[PDB]
């Protein structure tokens, strides 16, 4: 089955609009940024706001948010289902509901 979190190229505002209607904290999606070619962003619902994280890439081609690195978006997402996306707030990724 394809992943329910890959939304492709959707504007940041649309992502917020959609995530705001979600009922659970941690509801998220990965989108292709309009800020730069071939870049990804992670948008997550938390409380009454939507937080955005820029998916960084290093020289070897690994993805990362802070320090830990991943060989794919799939691994990054799966990791953050059990480990908080932030050290300051407890945010665990969970699939959106349709």
């Amino acid at each position: 089955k394809p992943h329910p979190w890959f939304f492709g190229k959707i504007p940041r505002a649309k992502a917020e609009e959609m995530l705001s209607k979600q009922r659970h904290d941690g509801a998220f999606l990965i989108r292709e940024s309009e800020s730069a070619p071939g870049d990804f962003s992670l948008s997550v619902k938390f409380g009454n706001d939507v937080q955005h994280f820029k998916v960084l890439r290093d020289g070897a081609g690994k993805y990362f948010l802070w320090v830990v690195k991943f060989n794919s978006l799939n691994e990054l997402v799966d990791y953050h289902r059990s480990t908080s996306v932030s050290r300051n707030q407890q945010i665990f990724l969970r699939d959106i509901e349709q």
Binding site: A13, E34, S41, H52, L56
Partner: peptide, 6 residues
């Protein structure tokens, strides 16, 4: 657009 990790 603000990013938490930036």
């Amino acid at each position: 657009x603000e990013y938490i990790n930036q």
